[model samples]
Each structure stands twice: as C-alpha cells, then as structure tokens.
Target: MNIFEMLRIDEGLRLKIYKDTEGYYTIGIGHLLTKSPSLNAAKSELDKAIGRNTNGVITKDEAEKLFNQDVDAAVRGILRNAKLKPVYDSLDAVRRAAAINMVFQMGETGVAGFTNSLRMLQQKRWDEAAVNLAKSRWYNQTPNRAKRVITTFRTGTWDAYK
Candidate 1:
C-alpha cells in the first residue's frame, strides 16, 4: 500500500475539529491545527481551504487536501533532517513508510527523539529498532498503532501491519 493509505488508516479521517492525545486541536487525518501560528489563524486558514468554515465542518475532499499536505510535510521533514536523511535513504519503501508514519503522528522532532531506534534502523537491526521504538511513551499512549508500526519495522513487510 502507499504511504497515504497507510496513514489514512492509522490517523483516520475526520470532518470536524477535535483535540489530539496531548490536547492539541487537531483535525483531518491528524492535522495539528493548534500548532499553526495561532489557533484562530489555523481555523481561519482551514476554513479558507474548505471555501468556508461551516462551524468547523469540512468535506472529505477538504480533509484529503489537508492530509496530503501534512504527509508531504512529514516526508520532507524527514528527508531534510540531518540525522534522519541517511537513515531514511537506506530503508525500503515499507520501512520508509513506517518512518513517515511516526513523523506523521508525533512530528519530526518527536520522532528524532528515538536516537536508539534510528541507529538500529540505520544499521538494519529490525528487531532492535522495533524494541527501541516500543520503549517510548508514544508506544504506551497508542499501543495498537505502536505494535503495528513496530511489527512492520521488524518484519520489513507491510502484511503484518495490514
């Protein structure tokens, strides 16, 4: 499957605004609106993208647009990251998707915190990478997703996660 589809499944689609695990205002396949210059600006910008706000409502198409943009940012964020660039380059499509997924969930900086996991992944140590990833609070906060991503990393196949 493509990265977009995987992220769509894991992040899920939404037509309205809601708070994320850390209480940040989020929407549309894990888009963190709260992180925009300001929450008010974020809402206004999204409203404009949707052609109108409609009291926080959005179309699937609109959500898809946001999702696409966010995922693109995540991918670019990783590729541009100094420490992650080489790690990302050495990985296969499945593992690359896994990396992108983590960035999608927690932002690039957050994913960068997993120094041990990145090192393991870079060295082609699948189980060690998974183990390191599983040792994080992100894993505990979202155990099922963590397992799916970690398993994907460990097996080097999307079938396990699928």
Candidate 2:
C-alpha cells in the first residue's frame, strides 16, 4: 500500500506501543494519541489509530467529527458534578460559559479543586475569582489563553479566545 511506502520501515505497524529516544509514550505508528489519562475526543482517535491506518490515515474530518462529543462531555460533566452543579447553575450565562471553558481545559474535577475560587464564583465575586485564577499554574502554562479566560471571568463577558 502507498501508506506503507509513506510510513516506511522506521515507523513500524499498527497497535505497537513503544517509548522513543526521549522517553515518551506513543502508539500505532508512533501516534501520540496513546492514553496517559486521555481526553474525550481523543478516545476515538486512539482506538482508530490502534485499529485503522490499514490503508489510510486518521482523517481531519474524523477528528473534527468527535469534537462535539468531547465538548458535550465537558458540559454534562460540569452540569452534574456535585460541587460544581450548583455553582454552575448560579452563574450568569456568560460566566457559566466560563466554567465550561475551565472544565474543557482541565476537566470538572480540576475546576472543583479550586475550592476557594469556586466559593468566590458562587458569591459572584468576579474580581476575587480573577485574582485566584491568575495565581494558578494554569495561568502560567498558557498565559495568553488564561488571560482571555480570566478576563471573561473577571468581566462576565467574552474574550477574543473565540
């Protein structure tokens, strides 16, 4: 097959899990979609990477297809999280959307882990919420994106992150 010619002898076969020279995990043609705890949309990519590529690649359309499901998981997960549900419900529409952004970025448990911040959110303290949010490693990890999300939280409005 042309894919075999494309991948060549160096890349190897489907369903093989191996570590590279840098000590990182990869699977099935050295695909980085392997599980370390995993993401929701990547679930399909992982299984497909393991099972597909017999004669083709994991298409961009295929990856785009599951985006909604992962986002849906994030939304539903936040809506049903015992600690988050009420806090989520009490938020204004724009602010509630901010919670979804956080849950999407780090999962519902990650948001719930910010207990004092959640308390500030429940009290509708946007300033205090932003203060706490800016103090996190998440803020440092992707300062630009975090700035936008934090700005939305602080102002109860959207940012250019869209």
Candidate 3:
C-alpha cells in the first residue's frame, strides 16, 4: 500500500494522548511510553525530552517520525535477541513478521516472560503455542489483538482480523 494509506491503517492519526491496547499512555500513533524506573529519573528524562514539568504533546509529523524511528529500533532489537532468534527464524515470513510485531509491542524482557508460549513455539507445537499465548496477561489486556496474533500463529495466515 501507499504511505498515507499505510499510516492511516496502522497508526489512526490520533491528536492526543490516549491509552494504548496495553493501557499505557501513548500519543501520536503508537509511541509506547518510557518510564525511567524511578520518579526522579522519569521526571529528569521527561524534562530533558520535553522541557516541561507536565505531560507533553507532539505534532502528527513529529509522531510519524518518532514512530518510524521506534520501528527501526524494535526491528533491530528483535533481530538481535539471541534467545528468540532460533524460534523467530524458524517461522515463515508471515509468522516471522507477527513475531517481530509481538516483540515490538512487548519489549524483549516482556516477550521473554512468555516462557510457555515461546517454549511451545520452539517445540513446533502450534496449538499449544496459541493456547499459551491466549492465556497470557498480554492477551487479557488486549483480547482482540491477542486473538488476532494467536490466530495468525496457528493458521499461518494474516486473515484473522480480516
């Protein structure tokens, strides 16, 4: 698809902060938030990034740019994940893309926590993998998306949401 069409389909062109599928505060497309693990550090980073004490906002162009950069980072991180590489590389391109998207949504650490699901994937147990993925906290938080991803994994197709 074209650039504008893809952006609209993917990001939804939001103008303000809204809770994402996982309930994290997000703005301008799919920019998952950043917390510094401590209030002081969070504040410091926020101040540094936005030059303000309050939650900040951005333009659509800015958000698009940030989203592009974030996607690159997530792709790199997913590729470099040693533990996940074997299971990831074993999949067809469609499933591999789904796995990368999952890694994007859940950071490496969060995705790593899906021990049962990953184990099933590693063992080539498609049904068990779907079940385990569906049983995750990630699924509970985002049932629609989780169901879609689980369906893709089980069926090896991207038609679940269609």
Candidate 4:
C-alpha cells in the first residue's frame, strides 16, 4: 500500500487491523491489534503495556512483537542519557548489554534512577548485576528472551535459546 493510503488507516484504526475475531477487544498499536492485550478504555498507554489479560486470547507472536518495541524503546532511552553513557560504556561483555536490554524492556526510568545496580554494573559484578536485574521483574516479569540473555552472560556460555 502507498504511504498515503496506509496513513489513512487512522492511527487508532491501524491497531484495529488485528482485532479479535469476536471483536472482544485486542491489544493494538496503529493498525496492529494483539489478541489479548488490548488497551482498556480507562488506562494510560503505559498502564496498558504492563497490564495483563486472562482472556486466553493472546498469541505469542503478537505479544513478542509488542514486547520488542517496548524493550527497544527502553534501551534507547537509556543510551540517550548523557550522564549515564560513561557508566554504561564501562560495562563489559554480554552482562552489561543484556542487563541494559532487560531494563529497557522493563523500565529504563526506574532502573536508571537506581544508584546501587548501576554501581555494581560499573564494577563489572556480573552476579550482582543479574540479581539487580532480577529485582526489576517485580515490575516487568522479565521476558523469556531477556532471561535467556542474562543467563548466557552470567555463565559465559551460549545456549540454544540464549
């Protein structure tokens, strides 16, 4: 489709493209509706991102797509912080990279605001770093991919999944 035509798909309507077959409501983002994670009428976008649905209506593919976007944004936001760059740059190996990705997918603002975790990361304490990352799961429930990445980094070995 031409850019204009595609653009005509209202930002809201674009999300409807993936509507549930039952029209029960689906998660959406500009012409992309996910099966079970749709936005609730009363919540903010951030709320919607963290909300869960028990409708047994979500597909992993849709969930993963949404997840990647979130994680990528979080990560980018971290990289954008001028004061944090020196600290972030000092990180070594997959440990730092994976943790950053995890925090990004979860919540950059919260993690970035933290002092101790960032300190341990700068110290190159992979184990302590993983612990810090795990603590964030209370908010993010860590994605499987992020979990695998952290494991790989901690163990210094690549696995089929990681």
Q: Best candidate, TM-score-wise? A: 1
Cα RMSD of all models vs. native, in order, equals 2.3, 10.5, 4.2, 11.0
Among all windows of ten consecutive residues in candidate 3, which has the lowest summed lDDT? 1-10
Q: Candidate 1 lDDT, tens digit per residue, 1-162? A: 878888887878778887777777777888877655456766776676667755677888878988888889999999899977889999998889989999989888998888889999999999778878888999999999889889888887888545
Give the Cα-based TM-score of candidate 3 against the true structure: 0.75
Question: Which candidate has the highest lDDT of all?
Answer: 1
Local distance difference test, each candidate: 0.83, 0.63, 0.66, 0.48
lDDT of 2 by residue, 1-162 (tens): 121222222233444344533344444443445345444435555667446543323444443333445557778998788999989899887777677777865678888998888889899898998899888988887677677767777887654333
Better by TM-score, candidate 3 or 2: 3
Name the lDDT of candidate 2.
0.63
Task: Give candidate 1 misplaced runs (Cα > 4 Å).
Answer: 35-42, 48-51
For residues 1-162, write the lDDT of model 4, one tens digit per residue: 221221122112222224433343434432223334555441233245546542323444555455457545645766787645656678554444554544543356655665676776677686886676566553354345445655644654445141
Q: Which of the predicted structures, 3 or 4, would earn the higher TM-score when compared with the native?
A: 3
Off by over 4 Å in 2: 1-32, 35-45, 49-51, 54-57
TM-score, per-candidate, Cα-based:
0.89, 0.67, 0.75, 0.46
Pairs that collide in candidate 2 are none
Residue 39 lDDT (model 4):
55
| Candidate 3 segments whose C-alpha is farther than 4 A from its true place | 1-11, 21-23, 35-55
- Which ranges in model 4 have alpha carbons more than 4 Å from their true place? 1-72, 82-84, 135-149, 160-162
